[PDB]
Design a protein around this ligand. Structure first.
Ligand SMILES: *CC(=O)NCc1ccc(F)c(C)c1
Length: 225
């Protein structure tokens, strides 16, 4: 379990911030709303790896939701082609993602899903797929991202340098784009060392979330309500 941990009690993360007044306060408050946490490896891929694992975990045993998600994933090659990606270059990454979706359907266990996400090869193929789909979704909707995020940004350069490469860190744009590309509703809780309220953001605004993440010390960990 070197990439995604076993479930732990929320208060077990006090030990990561010993004798720290603000972090203790915020973690205690978080424990009133959430029961458990899984930690992810801080290798620069932790947003993609956490969202992918936590969303597929949320589908286990839900036959209608699995059918609808599979239908969407089957169309994603067309998003990649429309943005200029070549089939022979994305094939291995698409096939790895479709495979883990079929595991959710056929096997249906937490333990089998966690083993794929802890297999460095399978897990990194899944992350690379998610990064290419993020990039495609932004490129195909460049006017949307310039209108609503930043009129001055260079969309093609941003995707080349800050989305496609492994180990590149995320901001609001990547989170919004992957949420929209796969129709995943997610809530991010923010824990920093300023003397401020524990607070959160939902993607898209106003949705009921499937996934909850904790953003703390530049890392995305998985929460359980
Ligand atoms: C999500 C992810 O892989 N984060 C890696 C990380 C951990 C600590 C930091 F200070 C940075 C810049 C990144």
């Amino acid at each position: 379990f070197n990439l995604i941990s076993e479930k732990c009690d929320i208060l077990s993360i006090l030990r990561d911030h010993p004798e720290n007044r603000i972090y203790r306060r915020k973690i205690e408050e978080l424990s009133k709303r959430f029961t458990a946490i899984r930690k992810t490896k801080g290798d620069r891929n932790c947003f993609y790896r956490a969202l992918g694992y936590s969303y597929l975990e949320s589908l286990l045993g839900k036959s209608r939701e699995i059918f609808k998600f599979k239908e969407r994933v089957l169309q994603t090659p067309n998003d990649l082609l429309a943005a200029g990606f070549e089939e022979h270059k994305f094939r291995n990454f698409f096939n790895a993602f479709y495979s883990v979706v079929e595991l959710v359907e056929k096997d249906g266990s937490v333990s089998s899903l966690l083993k794929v996400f802890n297999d460095q090869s399978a897990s990194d193929h899944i992350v690379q797929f998610l990064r290419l789909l993020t990039s495609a979704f932004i490129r195909n909707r460049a006017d949307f991202f310039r209108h609503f995020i930043d009129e001055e940004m260079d969309i093609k350069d941003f995707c080349t340098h800050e989305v496609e490469p492994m180990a590149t860190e995320c901001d609001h744009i990547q989170i919004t784009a992957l949420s929209q590309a796969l129709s995943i509703a997610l809530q991010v809780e923010y824990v920093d060392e300023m003397d401020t309220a524990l607070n959160h953001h939902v993607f898209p605004e106003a949705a009921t979330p499937s996934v909850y993440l904790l953003y703390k010390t530049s890392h995305y960990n998985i929460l359980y309500a």
